[PDB]
Amino acid sequence: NPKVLKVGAIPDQNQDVLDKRFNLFSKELSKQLDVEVKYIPVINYIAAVTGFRTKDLDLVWFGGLSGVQARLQTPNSIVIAQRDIDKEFKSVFVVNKNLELNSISNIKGLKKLKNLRFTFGSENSTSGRLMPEYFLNQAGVEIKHFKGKKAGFSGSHDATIALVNSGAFDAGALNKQVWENNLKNNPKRTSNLELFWITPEYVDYHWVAQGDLENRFGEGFTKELKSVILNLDIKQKSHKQILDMFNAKRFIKAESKQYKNIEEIGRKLNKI
Template identity: 40%
Template sequence: MKLLRKYLAPLLVVLAPAAMAETFTFTAIPDEDESQLRTRFEKVADYLETKLGVEVKYVPVKSYSAAVTAFRNNQVQLAWFGGLSGVQARRLVPGSEAIAQGFEDQFFKSYFIAHHSTGLERSENFPAIGGYTFTFGSKDSTSGRLMPQFFLERNLGKRPKDLFKRVGFSGDHSRTVSQVEAGVYQVGAVNYKVWDSMVEAGKVDTSKVKVIWESPVYPDYQWTVRGDLNKRFGDGFKARVTQALLEMKDPDLLASFPRQSFVPADNEDFQPVEDVAKAIGLID
């Protein structure tokens, strides 16, 4: 037996990387509290594992840029990106594809929110918010930075640094809400889905912070896969992943995003995001 183990040991070492390659990994941009993300995406991992017949692992990351880096470095093969982070990732990984998006992501929007001390009220016209303190979400967020900055520049004619007393980046949407509610910043931009979910859950004191403007719609979140998926996991694997996402019907899983369903997507759907990112100088 010892002799057998002696000759098998080198073989097991050689086989170990191949066994590891059978684990399908994915990540997601950290747009909310980390503990909530872990809970919801570990459930998604269990669902995908059942559907795909391979081990599936959710890999948490600390920032939007870390999600893009993990995808670029092949640490993950699938990612739940925002519009901008998806564009960034696909530019870095030739052959990668957007394969599905939430039904709502076809017409996403941002809210501008304000602390009650400003006296600002909700309006259909873009608010005169120059001179206040302002916070975006993550620097790479579509709904918390890219599109809000575009709407600011288009409507008020100045860069954020020239518009506000102080400009911040909270890091995620839930922190944006908390900081504006607390008066750390007077005005901020937030993902409408996160705001609506927090209000519904009773996590926002609407006597202290309110929505003052709702943006026009734009494409946002999507699932993106690396182009070498079939080569690594076998012919037809990308199609199976896509089908599994489109067939996600469990109300609890969908509510954790929150989305009513997932629909097909492709790279061209997010050309408007790339165009805006180029227009305001976030990408070349």
């Protein structure tokens, strides 16, 4: 459907949260751009990348890694925007309380996760897999060192929390924002979890648009679209509803050069 602007997103959180966020976003874009806009859910991160490649998704909220993947598979696509926090994003390592493991203060303390049952997020997650594995590796910890010589891949940050909180795994890593989100707001999900370590900063989430939108939507559509997103204003009611769902005060400009470190780490870990 070429007259419909199709919004996608990596499924980094439970679908109820995604539905609310992306449906509201899509409605606001629709009003401001005067085109039909539909949020199209996907089953996993790979599906977001593939949907974008096959031009079944036009505008997608990607993670660092998956956005890089998408843009490598889909030449001449456009980096649109990010949040302030996405310039200085962090992961957390969390542990189940039943371990009585205490927090650490130097990356080398990740050695204490050896011989535990460990879960990452999505195989293609920046904050729940790539960066955690990078830092584990810096500390001499490899996946083979976990219980079973393997790690879990939960597929989402909410799913990681649930797995470690239930005791299906001993420890995991996830999006720091999502963690703090749950700690404060929905603490029944984090009942059995303690903070183990906070990572250094890296770049993460961003919006990516197809590069050929002008042919469907007219001259200047992309600039207008970019403008809509960047001009969302917390002082406005409907805008604030959206922005609060992204846990941000605004969107800001983002560019492709920013993701060089993610791309390089992705190559090193054979995750491109």
